[PDB]
Amino acid sequence: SRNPIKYSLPRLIYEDLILPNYNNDVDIANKLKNVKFNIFNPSTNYELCLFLSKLTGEPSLNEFFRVSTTPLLKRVIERTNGPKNTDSLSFKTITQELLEVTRNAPSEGVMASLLNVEKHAYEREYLNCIQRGYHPNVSAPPVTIEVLGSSHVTNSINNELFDPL
Amino acid sequence: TRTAAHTHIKGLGLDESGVAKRVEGGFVGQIEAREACGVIVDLIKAKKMSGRAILLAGGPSTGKTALALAISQELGPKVPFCPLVGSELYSVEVKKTETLMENFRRAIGLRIKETKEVYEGEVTELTPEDAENPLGGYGKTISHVIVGLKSAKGTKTLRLDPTIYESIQREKVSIGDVIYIEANTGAVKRVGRSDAYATEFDLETEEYVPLPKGEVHKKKEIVQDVTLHDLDVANARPQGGQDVISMMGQLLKPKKTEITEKLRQEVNKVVAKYIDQGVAELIPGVLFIDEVNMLDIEIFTYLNKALESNIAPVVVLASNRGMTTVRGTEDVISPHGVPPDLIDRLLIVRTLPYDKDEIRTIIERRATVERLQVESSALDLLATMGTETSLRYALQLLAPCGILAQTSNRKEIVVNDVNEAKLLFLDAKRSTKILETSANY
Amino acid sequence: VTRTAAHTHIKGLGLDESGVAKRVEGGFVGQIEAREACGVIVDLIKAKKMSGRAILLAGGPSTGKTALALAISQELGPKVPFCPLVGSELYSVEVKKTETLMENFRRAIGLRIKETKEVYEGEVTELTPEDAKTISHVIVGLKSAKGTKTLRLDPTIYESIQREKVSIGDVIYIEANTGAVKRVGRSDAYATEFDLETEEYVPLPKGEVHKKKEIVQDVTLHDLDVANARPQGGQDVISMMGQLLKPKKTEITEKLRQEVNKVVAKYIDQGVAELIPGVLFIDEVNMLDIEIFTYLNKALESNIAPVVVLASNRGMTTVRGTEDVISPHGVPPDLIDRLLIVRTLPYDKDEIRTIIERRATVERLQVESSALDLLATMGTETSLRYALQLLAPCGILAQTSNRKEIVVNDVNEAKLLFLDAKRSTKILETSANYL
Amino acid sequence: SLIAAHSHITGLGLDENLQPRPTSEGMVGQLQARRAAGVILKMVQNGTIAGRAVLVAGPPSTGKTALAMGVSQSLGKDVPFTAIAGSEIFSLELSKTEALTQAFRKSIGIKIKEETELIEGEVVEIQIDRSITGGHKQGKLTIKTTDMETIYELGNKMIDGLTKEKVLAGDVISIDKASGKITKLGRSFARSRDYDAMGADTRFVQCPEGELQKRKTVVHTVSLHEIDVINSRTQGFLALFTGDTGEIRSEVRDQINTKVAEWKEEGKAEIVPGVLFIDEVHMLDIECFSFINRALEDEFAPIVMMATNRGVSKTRGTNYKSPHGLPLDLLDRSIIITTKSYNEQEIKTILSIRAQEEEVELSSDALDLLTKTGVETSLRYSSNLISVAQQIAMKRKNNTVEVEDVKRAYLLFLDSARSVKYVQENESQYIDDQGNVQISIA
Amino acid sequence: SLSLIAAHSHITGLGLDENLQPRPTSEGMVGQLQARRAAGVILKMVQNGTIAGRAVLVAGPPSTGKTALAMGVSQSLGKDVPFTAIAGSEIFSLELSKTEALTQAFRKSIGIKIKEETELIEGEVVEIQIDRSITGGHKQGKLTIKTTDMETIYELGNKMIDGLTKEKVLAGDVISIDKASGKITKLGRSFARSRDYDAMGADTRFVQCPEGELQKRKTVVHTVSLHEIDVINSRTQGFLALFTGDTGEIRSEVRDQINTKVAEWKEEGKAEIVPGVLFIDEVHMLDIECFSFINRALEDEFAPIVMMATNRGVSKTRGTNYKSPHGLPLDLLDRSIIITTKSYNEQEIKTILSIRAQEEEVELSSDALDLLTKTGVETSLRYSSNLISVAQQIAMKRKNNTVEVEDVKRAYLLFLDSARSVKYVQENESQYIDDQGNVQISIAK
Ligand SMILES: Nc1ncnc2c1ncn2[C@@H]1O[C@H](COP(=O)(O)OP(=O)(O)O)[C@@H](O)[C@H]1O
Ligand SMILES: Nc1ncnc2c1ncn2[C@@H]1O[C@H](COP(=O)(O)OP(=O)(O)O)[C@@H](O)[C@H]1O
Ligand SMILES: Nc1ncnc2c1ncn2[C@@H]1O[C@H](COP(=O)(O)OP(=O)(O)O)[C@@H](O)[C@H]1O
Numbered sequence A: 001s002r003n004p005i006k007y008s009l010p011r012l013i014y015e016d017l018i019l020p021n022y023n024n025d026v027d028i029a030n031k032l033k034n035v036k037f038n039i040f041n042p043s044t045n046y047e048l049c050l051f052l053s054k055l056t057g058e059p060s061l062n063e064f065f066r067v068s069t070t071p072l073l074k075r076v077i078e079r080t081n082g083p084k085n086t087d088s089l090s091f092k093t094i095t096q097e098l099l100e101v102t103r104n105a106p107s108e109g110v111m112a113s114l115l116n117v118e119k120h121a122y123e124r125e126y127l128n129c130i131q132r133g134y135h136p137n138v139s140a141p142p143v144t145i146e147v148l149g150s151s152h153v154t155n156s157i158n159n160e161l162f163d164p165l
Numbered sequence B: 001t002r003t004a005a006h007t008h009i010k011g012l013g014l015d016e017s018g019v020a021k022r023v024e025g026g027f028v029g030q031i032e033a034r035e036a037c038g039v040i041v042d043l044i045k046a047k048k049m050s051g052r053a054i055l056l057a058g059g060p061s062t063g064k065t066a067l068a069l070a071i072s073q074e075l076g077p078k079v080p081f082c083p084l085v086g087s088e089l090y091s092v093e094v095k096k097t098e099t100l101m102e103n104f105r106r107a108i109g110l111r112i113k114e115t116k117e118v119y120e121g122e123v124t125e126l127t128p129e130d131a132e133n134p135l136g137g138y139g140k141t142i143s144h145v146i147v148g149l150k151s152a153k154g155t156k157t158l159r160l161d162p163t164i165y166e167s168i169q170r171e172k173v174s175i176g177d178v179i180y181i182e183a184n185t186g187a188v189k190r191v192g193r194s195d196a197y198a199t200e201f202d203l204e205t206e207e208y209v210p211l212p213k214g215e216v217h218k219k220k221e222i223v224q225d226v227t228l229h230d231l232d233v234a235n236a237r238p239q240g241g242q243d244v245i246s247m248m249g250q251l252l253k254p255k256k257t258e259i260t261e262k263l264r265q266e267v268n269k270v271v272a273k274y275i276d277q278g279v280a281e282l283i284p285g286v287l288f289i290d291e292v293n294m295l296d297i298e299i300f301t302y303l304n305k306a307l308e309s310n311i312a313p314v315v316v317l318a319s320n321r322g323m324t325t326v327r328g329t330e331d332v333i334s335p336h337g338v339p340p341d342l343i344d345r346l347l348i349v350r351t352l353p354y355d356k357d358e359i360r361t362i363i364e365r366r367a368t369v370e371r372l373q374v375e376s377s378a379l380d381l382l383a384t385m386g387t388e389t390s391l392r393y394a395l396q397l398l399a400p401c402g403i404l405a406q407t408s409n410r411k412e413i414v415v416n417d418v419n420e421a422k423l424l425f426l427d428a429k430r431s432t433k434i435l436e437t438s439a440n441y
Numbered sequence C: 001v002t003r004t005a006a007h008t009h010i011k012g013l014g015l016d017e018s019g020v021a022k023r024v025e026g027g028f029v030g031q032i033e034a035r036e037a038c039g040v041i042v043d044l045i046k047a048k049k050m051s052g053r054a055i056l057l058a059g060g061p062s063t064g065k066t067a068l069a070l071a072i073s074q075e076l077g078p079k080v081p082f083c084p085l086v087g088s089e090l091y092s093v094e095v096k097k098t099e100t101l102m103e104n105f106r107r108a109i110g111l112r113i114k115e116t117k118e119v120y121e122g123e124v125t126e127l128t129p130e131d132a133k134t135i136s137h138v139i140v141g142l143k144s145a146k147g148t149k150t151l152r153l154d155p156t157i158y159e160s161i162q163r164e165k166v167s168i169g170d171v172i173y174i175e176a177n178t179g180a181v182k183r184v185g186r187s188d189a190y191a192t193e194f195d196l197e198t199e200e201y202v203p204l205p206k207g208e209v210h211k212k213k214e215i216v217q218d219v220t221l222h223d224l225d226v227a228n229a230r231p232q233g234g235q236d237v238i239s240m241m242g243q244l245l246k247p248k249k250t251e252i253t254e255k256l257r258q259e260v261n262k263v264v265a266k267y268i269d270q271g272v273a274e275l276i277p278g279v280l281f282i283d284e285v286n287m288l289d290i291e292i293f294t295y296l297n298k299a300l301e302s303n304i305a306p307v308v309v310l311a312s313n314r315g316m317t318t319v320r321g322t323e324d325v326i327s328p329h330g331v332p333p334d335l336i337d338r339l340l341i342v343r344t345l346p347y348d349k350d351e352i353r354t355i356i357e358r359r360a361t362v363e364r365l366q367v368e369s370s371a372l373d374l375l376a377t378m379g380t381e382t383s384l385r386y387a388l389q390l391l392a393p394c395g396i397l398a399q400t401s402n403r404k405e406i407v408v409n410d411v412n413e414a415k416l417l418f419l420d421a422k423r424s425t426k427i428l429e430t431s432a433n434y435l
Numbered sequence D: 001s002l003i004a005a006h007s008h009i010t011g012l013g014l015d016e017n018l019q020p021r022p023t024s025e026g027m028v029g030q031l032q033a034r035r036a037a038g039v040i041l042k043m044v045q046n047g048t049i050a051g052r053a054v055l056v057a058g059p060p061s062t063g064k065t066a067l068a069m070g071v072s073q074s075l076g077k078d079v080p081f082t083a084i085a086g087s088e089i090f091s092l093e094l095s096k097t098e099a100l101t102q103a104f105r106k107s108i109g110i111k112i113k114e115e116t117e118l119i120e121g122e123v124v125e126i127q128i129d130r131s132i133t134g135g136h137k138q139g140k141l142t143i144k145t146t147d148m149e150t151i152y153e154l155g156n157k158m159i160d161g162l163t164k165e166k167v168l169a170g171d172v173i174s175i176d177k178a179s180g181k182i183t184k185l186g187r188s189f190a191r192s193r194d195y196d197a198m199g200a201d202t203r204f205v206q207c208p209e210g211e212l213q214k215r216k217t218v219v220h221t222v223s224l225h226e227i228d229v230i231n232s233r234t235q236g237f238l239a240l241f242t243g244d245t246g247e248i249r250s251e252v253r254d255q256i257n258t259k260v261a262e263w264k265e266e267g268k269a270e271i272v273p274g275v276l277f278i279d280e281v282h283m284l285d286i287e288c289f290s291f292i293n294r295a296l297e298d299e300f301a302p303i304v305m306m307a308t309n310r311g312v313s314k315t316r317g318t319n320y321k322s323p324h325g326l327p328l329d330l331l332d333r334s335i336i337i338t339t340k341s342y343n344e345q346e347i348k349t350i351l352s353i354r355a356q357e358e359e360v361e362l363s364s365d366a367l368d369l370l371t372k373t374g375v376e377t378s379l380r381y382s383s384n385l386i387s388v389a390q391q392i393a394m395k396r397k398n399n400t401v402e403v404e405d406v407k408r409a410y411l412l413f414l415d416s417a418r419s420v421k422y423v424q425e426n427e428s429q430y431i432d433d434q435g436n437v438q439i440s441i442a
Numbered sequence E: 001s002l003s004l005i006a007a008h009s010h011i012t013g014l015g016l017d018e019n020l021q022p023r024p025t026s027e028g029m030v031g032q033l034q035a036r037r038a039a040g041v042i043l044k045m046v047q048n049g050t051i052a053g054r055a056v057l058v059a060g061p062p063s064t065g066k067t068a069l070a071m072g073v074s075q076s077l078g079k080d081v082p083f084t085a086i087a088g089s090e091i092f093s094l095e096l097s098k099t100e101a102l103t104q105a106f107r108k109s110i111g112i113k114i115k116e117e118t119e120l121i122e123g124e125v126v127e128i129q130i131d132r133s134i135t136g137g138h139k140q141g142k143l144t145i146k147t148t149d150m151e152t153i154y155e156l157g158n159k160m161i162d163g164l165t166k167e168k169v170l171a172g173d174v175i176s177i178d179k180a181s182g183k184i185t186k187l188g189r190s191f192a193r194s195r196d197y198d199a200m201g202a203d204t205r206f207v208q209c210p211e212g213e214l215q216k217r218k219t220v221v222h223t224v225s226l227h228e229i230d231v232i233n234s235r236t237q238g239f240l241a242l243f244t245g246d247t248g249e250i251r252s253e254v255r256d257q258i259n260t261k262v263a264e265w266k267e268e269g270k271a272e273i274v275p276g277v278l279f280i281d282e283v284h285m286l287d288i289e290c291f292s293f294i295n296r297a298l299e300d301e302f303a304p305i306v307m308m309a310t311n312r313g314v315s316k317t318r319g320t321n322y323k324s325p326h327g328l329p330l331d332l333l334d335r336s337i338i339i340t341t342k343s344y345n346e347q348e349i350k351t352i353l354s355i356r357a358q359e360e361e362v363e364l365s366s367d368a369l370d371l372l373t374k375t376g377v378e379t380s381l382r383y384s385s386n387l388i389s390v391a392q393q394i395a396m397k398r399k400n401n402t403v404e405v406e407d408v409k410r411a412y413l414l415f416l417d418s419a420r421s422v423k424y425v426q427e428n429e430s431q432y433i434d435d436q437g438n439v440q441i442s443i444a445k
């Protein structure tokens, strides 16, 4: 499936502004902005890393550098419920506790049914046997960007559109 | 050892079956307003009415918010109390009507009791037992899970469900960890290794929780106090799920949203169902909206709408204005900045200014709550300054007087200290006088 | 060939070594005192010692305030940062105006980084990993026309290579310092393995495999503030599509600015970085809000604030955001205490004629002597900018009749076809239905 | 839930001939207004026509919102009554026309008929097969009665409902097929070798007899706005509670209009029109009124009741004054009900009904004093004095509000006129319009 | 330490004695003896830490030393005390309310002090081995850590093993592991292995191998404001909002919970409360809603001492339609004590100009300083302060090391003050765009 709208882009822009070569400084400035002058770098800003590690209770001081240098959707996906130390300022406020208490709690419990309002409205209103009344008129894929005569752009577009993770 | 413009007041000062006397509970004077607030406190403790608005008005430096904090102290910390100013209602993420509705629901509490059968302790053994006839094509067909929990003054082995082994191996429970088992849900939850296993590795991450007290199996009667707004917030956003939208919302900014009437109605009906069941009970509280003349006509109209609701708390308003224009209008002159349709819906309490002796007694009480020693002649001079310029100016000058006394290494404030502090720190009238006489911008 | 747009004859302030302005130098005609004051300001910027030094240059419209600011930016060179700004640009709908003013403040403080670019490129002739399921080191043998080179590599570069699906024979690009891997394509030696193939084929590079280069990285403090305060997160080097969540500008806290200043000072103390303070030029300052005018007072007293240059063509005008504060140049008096005011004078007939001749020379136009005094008379009668902007229709009307000279008839024709503001207003007043 | 301002009103108090009784169902007097509201109620319950604007105009403290609450209480269940204020339209995430469209479509209910099957029996055997990550779940359920025995097939949602409120092969359950709801009715087999993990104190029920699968027909009412929000995006059910439905496109609305018309044609669903009540309707811009003038002319429009207390006041968003704060285009297509002020007798029995609603016992002289102070002042002040005087009477330990409790409540708590006189006699102590105040007493 | 010569960088604290008596010229502050004594009283109020929520108004004419007094108070306060200096227009936000910006500025100025013990084992690993057991449920390891002087072997638990698998260690990179806390960080590869891999990569950096004792003990004191705790507990990963400012209207329930937990930690002994100053420069540029919230938020127990500066006369309060003293309503001025700043004379202007010349490394003659003092008496003080630093550049352009009278005269001729510019505007008003938008562009008719 391809969009009928094609954005034809010259090879000069992609090979002189996005891709790194010998005559530009894409990689050098990218490293200089993301690693060398990052304020979460433990090699140069260890005091701030220790301060934030006391604040959040994260047992790794490199986690603030890893969080700030990853995409938000990727950070959503890779995140696992790691343990945090007790000696920290990031404690648990009360409704987070209740929500995390009412997980696999059964029915005829007060605190489970008090937090299952949407489930009771779903089951009471017979909402899982209702019929869909609206569909969109037109469905379209994203606009295909083509750079004629370049194979790197096809691999990059296929990696962005069909990212395996 | 921290004092800030208050906390010398401890309740109203009302004796039972009677009226308020002069100096009780940190209050001096204001007998009628204290008696009216005591009647309102009894009305809140009666736990029957809904949407009773009280407005108390007067001049500045009269003690309206002192009366509101006395109401909050007299009710106790168990009854909800939401102090608010009219400037909080103007938010940039959500409309002011939703902010007023949220602050209305924040002042209605719920007292929920629960019974929990809890197994807890250090794991002594963990043997997933096989069946007598295992089925082919699998490995370790578990018939039951035997765990051994040890605690203070007792230990007990358990025979658990076979499905708890996947929760144990998913939550990474090992031998010697302290776990937390509740009865009807399964749901293993380790808290950490015991403190008896803390000196076998030089370097390790996890904290070593102590060995838990009491028996391994116990019934604890817990009491949970949550407001209705907590239930609306916990029911608006869903439970912690396994979809990208929920974790995106958890990782992003918690933007406020317009909570629908359907969610509040469903929360109200399930709360009423569990009140009728005899488990939970309702404690209405006070929403104290201070400087109520800063509200405009739309929030006043929605206050008229929401004061007739079924689950509204009492609303306590304060305003120091007189016949003043209501904000949001250009030609509506109303008392206290409050429009007459809202004024019809509330009972007005009057607060009166003080004479010289009451100002002196308030200055003496604020000195004795700040751990300061004032001379009698210095007290008389401070009372004359307070009755000449402002009560708040004389109250705020006590700490510079104490520091100027401490500089000369004495523990008492004298008239030279108050003269030096008067010369150093000006008041509003003298500052306006030097503003008028000086033409140098 | 070349494009001239109301400037580019201004090559600089045109001063000598003693800071004295000649009458005609650097494309500047007249305006001796303001040019000498701007030279003193340029020397103050080049001293690199003071912070928050604010000046405002004021005068009538079409008198050369922006010309003086561009001459300052030309005299400082391209190394010193210069942030040209209009006063209307501070009003953003994404973030508050004080944050935009602080962003433009920190855009005018730059850094010089001496960095080394090292590039390995060529056809891959050997790709052998070495494990211990964890790769320990990677042996890669590149090949160019001048010879081969065999390199060890850490497993991160193999992670980037496996991202790039690099096989044997693919001409690739490796940066040594940053680890950037780019696959140019396959070589022509493997261009005949199939008659038709999806792969692209690039020739063998004629240069050496190992290339070293010394380059200069010119960044600003605002660039580091933006790169350290991405709200959603970082992004890869190659990303043709944006993030699914729209990233908007956020009010960057003082803590991030303090940490960025600490890191920059630490890099400066090692001699890696050099601090180049610059110029923030806000043009048409008179439409700044009183909020922005008030925040400018606090921002001018910062320790890292640049040299601020303001321009205004107002007289006794009300400050925007107020109702009765009548102040000179539209700038409030508490701010005007904090600047030095450089007066910009109007021109006479001879200066206008010389400016017209300079602009005609810089636009490659030959103007007759009789037409030049008529253009000077029209400049003194209507406006200097009207006489300057009529040179291009005069040139095209001359080229239409196959000529390379501006005759007086062509100037009369261009005056007849195009009207100034005065004759347009005269038509506007003596008309019935909307002009 | 608690005792509110209109909690004493359950209906309108009208007979079969739509004639108002003088005191019935908590509503006293206002016979023209109550008969008109009964006409409105019968016209809504008839449901034949749509989009009629009703205006309830009168002075403050008269019974306009009381009349609307009586109409809503006589409406009964399963009819959508939307009661909004004037200030709720102004939102930072919705436009005014979109908020008014949502308020309009919240008042049109769709009564959908559903054919379900009820399965109640004793669980014999449960086989649950899941993947290693627990994503794909399937299995078989063996459930029996005293007569029958059937092996069903489970899906993901069925297994999710099974593992919640967990059934242990011998508990009698009830499964609603269309709603997907499991209610564990109790435990029947009472197994001897129970695991010592859960609190096994389940109720003992018998195994049900007869048919295992019984067909049933159920009826539920879903408003049009809920269908719009559900079909708007893929997480519309959560947006029904968070209100994060930002400016639903018109294509969804017209397709859902066509689908609702098709459901009415098929006989699956029927349309239940309701009432949209806009309290304090003068607090709306002229943009809202100009949208309302065309929203009333649609077929899917409820019977709109508006209440306002303003005289000839300025219309919001403009610079001219109009009757009731509404432009003459809206007043042309509106039907106005006029409410009138009360005399001494009606005020007295209104106070008596409010006293018996609050469980407050008044003496006759205290009721006479309350009637006199509700004639001199407004009605709402004397109504609010009742609970205060009740608390004063319980402070002196007698369960009867005497005269002196009402006198003490009058002395302690002020009305509008007394506070106005106290402000105007002491204007130096209060901050005026010019911001001038005299904090000093000397 | 990225500071150039600012507007007031010469001021290092209020020049007071031990009896709170101001010296005539010390610590960069000249004159203003009553204002400096009152600022010393306010500084002692802050340092006592037992009086909270007091509003102080520093009022005076422009170019007098109100913000100079605030800078002196901030410099005399010292480090680790939260000082938040904001302008009046900083709270008019687009993503936050004025009340939310006010309370975020309020909670940025009061903090808690946390002392913790660090048993840091920082070194370069020699070799680490992965003992993949047959069961796989538990992993044990031996960590060979080294410095330039000694090298020890450490037994390693399984949580160490899968916390070192993440942020993976490759036998020669500098790490640092706490003993009691168990924190792990990877500082980077050593300089000994700099020529081992022929290309660096992206996520790597080269650091020096640490020297001396392998196991170090250090007590580090953390000062955390309440706003930091609010932003951290407002989300799941809150530090990104702490450094980007995308907090977004934190709800009051977590603020009440944080206040209760802070009081619990203060009573327990885990932390102690460090109050500070919130300085609102140019406080007249606030709405009346912000003023009422300022009045009613000063009575909280966890409130700092608010210092306010203004230079307005009887001016209009913003958001209203009436004038007021200092641009502030009378209820706000009721709960305040006003420090007034008096104008200067010739000697104090001369001393301030001399101190500002010494702070900028500019050498002046005696008669040049007399001319600058006469200019600062006739015109304002800031005009002469700028004339010093431009006459310095004139002197260096003239190949001279000292600033003479002629340099100051040339700087006076080149750069104009307010009065000369307003006279030159009023003489040629037809050449400027006035308030009606009329201007005479042409020089001849
Ligand atoms: N009757 C009283 N007895 C003791 N202290 C009082 C009394 N009235 C007022 N105060 C003190 O005066 C201070 C200011 O009063 P406040 O509540 O601000 O009055 P208002 O709200 O009318 O301005 C309060 O801190 C309070 O402690
Ligand atoms: N001394 C000068 N020599 C040459 N050109 C000048 C001189 N002064 C002004 N100009 C020209 O006149 C025009 C004035 O426009 P500009 O400086 O942008 O506006 P303003 O003078 O109102 O600040 C510029 O295009 C500039 O090229
Ligand atoms: N006829 C009535 N029956 C019952 N209660 C009434 C009646 N008339 C007035 N009330 C009471 O007086 C008040 C009427 O005011 P409201 O409901 O705001 O309507 P309106 O704004 O038209 O006066 C209500 O609180 C209601 O309890």
Ligand SMILES: Nc1ncnc2c1ncn2[C@@H]1O[C@H](COP(=O)(O)OP(=O)(O)O)[C@@H](O)[C@H]1O
Residues within 6 Å of the ligand: E007, E008, E009, E011, E028, E029, E030, E031, E032, E060, E061, E062, E063, E064, E065, E066, E067, E068, E069, E311, E352, E381, E382
């Ligand atoms: N007493 C003083 N001692 C030293 N420098 C001062 C003094 N008063 C003012 N200044 C200097 O004068 C300059 C302008 O004064 P400033 O404090 O900005 O006035 P204002 O407080 O009215 O804004 C500042 O750079 C400041 O350093």
